């Protein structure tokens, strides 16, 4: 096998992939790794069997740096996973991890601002950010959408966001929504005195239309926009990220259509690779998990991709799914956004798991507070601040979250109607 070189030592500039592959019976693992690998040739340098699985192996592939176009996530995905999931010799194939060498990382702009620049621009420190998804999902007029945005933001929420499928429809054209949301953002800012924002959806049919929506957001002076990178495409995302860096706009990224590629354990691309591709292409926030009942998915896997998308240097940790040491050479980090049913008594768990550098999203639209949207937002803000204060005092949140919530509720009438 010219393409299986177990004695090869990967270079400091090689792009490395870790494939979890299940070959068809009768096909030796070395032959299957050689096929995936097949001066500019990709080579399989390491194959390890998965202990506790049926005929499953991890194949490590090394690609020369000259194979890829500088600063192009599109080309990287075309080269690595263009036509390899269609090999008949493989029953199942799953890309688990990528190693982006610093030499390649330096060719990317990365996220427009990052976590620290975001915190400095918004003047919010020492706590997680809070967001809500305006509900109902669709049918609402731009005026009523703006009213809901203002009501939720004035309560104490830092962000609101358009629904993932809200781009521009007969019921609510995009420019009307942008104008009414801008009025709501400014009203809530004047009322509370804190900087507010709303994830305006710029996702559109053509790059020209998407840039026009970003331009309108820039002309209104609003802080942040939103994009669907897995449906819009890396090419559209990279254009939007370059624009946002040029014009000082924050960029929230929603991972629509992700489960179509990262759900099945045997086939597809693991979300961590999609998260690294997003960080390379550019995004200040990246919807990274759902909290149905509780944070779903293995905690270690979540922590692994959160560290991969946040930290500057992540050492190899197979326990958390890190197959390679990832040096980001000072590329700005991406803030993970945990969305879903974030109930008030579940805030301590998520604050403990994520820390301060994350945005908790109430994608359920809240509305569970009997008093209204604004008091519900206040209750959430009070709960988050109380949990953060308790954690800063040395309390163990996983053991005293209920006590902290009760103690905060003892003095908060808004949280009292929420804790019931």
């Amino acid at each position: 096998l010219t393409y299986y070189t177990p004695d090869y030592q990967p270079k400091d500039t090689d792009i490395l992939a870790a494939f979890r592959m299940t070959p068809q019976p009768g096909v030796p693992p070395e032959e299957a790794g050689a096929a995936v690998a097949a001066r500019y040739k990709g080579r399989c340098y390491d194959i390890e069997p998965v202990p506790g699985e049926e005929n499953q192996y991890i194949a490590y592939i090394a690609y020369p740096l000259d194979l890829f176009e500088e600063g192009s996530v599109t080309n990287l995905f075309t080269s690595i996973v263009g036509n390899v999931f269609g090999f008949k010799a493989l029953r199942a194939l799953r890309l688990e991890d990528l190693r982006i060498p610093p030499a390649y990382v330096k060719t990317f702009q990365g996220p427009p601002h990052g976590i620290q620049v975001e915190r400095d621009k918004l003047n919010k420190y020492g706590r997680g950010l809070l967001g809500c998804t305006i509900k109902p999902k669709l049918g609402l007029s731009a005026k009523n959408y703006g009213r809901a945005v203002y009501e939720c933001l004035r309560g104490g929420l830092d962000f609101t966001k358009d629904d993932e499928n809200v781009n521009s429809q007969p019921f609510m054209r995009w420019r009307d929504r942008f104008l009414f949301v801008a009025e709501a953002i400014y009203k809530s800012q004047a009322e509370t005195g804190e900087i507010k924002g709303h994830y305006l959806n710029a996702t559109a049919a053509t790059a020209e239309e998407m840039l026009k929506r970003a331009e309108c957001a820039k002309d209104l002076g609003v802080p942040i926009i939103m994009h669907d990178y897995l449906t819009g495409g890396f090419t559209a995302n990279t254009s939007l990220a370059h624009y946002c860096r040029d014009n000082g706009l924050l960029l929230h990224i929603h991972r629509a259509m992700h489960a179509v590629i990262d759900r099945q354990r045997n086939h597809g691309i693991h979300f961590r690779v999609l998260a690294k591709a997003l960080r390379l292409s550019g995004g200040d926030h990246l919807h990274s998990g759902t909290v149905v009942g509780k944070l779903e998915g293995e905690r270690e896997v979540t922590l692994g991709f959160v560290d991969l998308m946040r930290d500057d240097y992540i050492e190899k940790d197979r326990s958390r799914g890190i197959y390679f040491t990832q040096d980001w050479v000072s590329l700005p980090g991406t803030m993970p956004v945990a969305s879903g049913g974030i109930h008030v008594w579940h805030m301590p768990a998520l604050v403990e798991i994520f820390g301060d550098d994350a945005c908790l999203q109430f994608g359920g639209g809240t509305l569970g507070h009997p008093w209204g949207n604004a008091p519900g937002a206040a209750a959430n803000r009070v709960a988050l601040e109380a949990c953060t204060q308790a954690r800063n005092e040395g309390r163990d949140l996983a053991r005293e979250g209920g006590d902290v919530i009760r103690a905060a509720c003892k003095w908060s009438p808004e949280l009292a109607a929420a804790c019931e």
Binding site: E191, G193, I195, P223, G248, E414
Partner: protein, 133 residues
């Protein structure tokens, strides 16, 4: 109940909790010091405490992510010293909001920022029970 939109201003972190006592401020400063960070004190009167768009009149192209009064005025070993400085700032400027800031000395970035004082004279803010009417 209805969240009051009248005289209900807030100052970011820990602003939605009841006013912190000396022991609570001390514990927060000890947390900042434990992490290896430097605590300092910011203060501003009521005229330059809230965000504003006063200087946006001088700008073209865009004003995205620009807000006035994000910077306050600067006023660092342990909680007791920062508490003493908090009392000193209170005496020197009784009508000024005081904010405790944290700075990571290695990354050279601001890592903390919570209000610790609200001037009794100013009435632009509500109390934990008067926030809803």
């Amino acid at each position: 109940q209805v969240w009051t939109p009248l005289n209900n201003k807030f100052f970011e972190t820990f602003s939605y909790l009841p006013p912190m006592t000396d022991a609570e401020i001390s514990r927060q400063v000890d947390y900042i010091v434990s992490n290896g960070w430097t605590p300092c004190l910011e203060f501003a009167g009521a005229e330059s405490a809230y965000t504003s768009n006063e200087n946006c009149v001088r700008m073209q192209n865009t004003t995205c992510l620009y807000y006035d009064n994000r910077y306050w005025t600067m006023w660092c070993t342990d909680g007791g010293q920062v508490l003493r400085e908090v009392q000193a700032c209170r005496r020197a400027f009784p009508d000024a909001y005081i904010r405790v800031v944290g700075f990571d000395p290695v990354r050279q970035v601001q890592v903390s920022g919570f209000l610790v004082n609200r001037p009794a004279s100013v009435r632009d803010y509500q109390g934990p029970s008067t926030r809803s009417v």
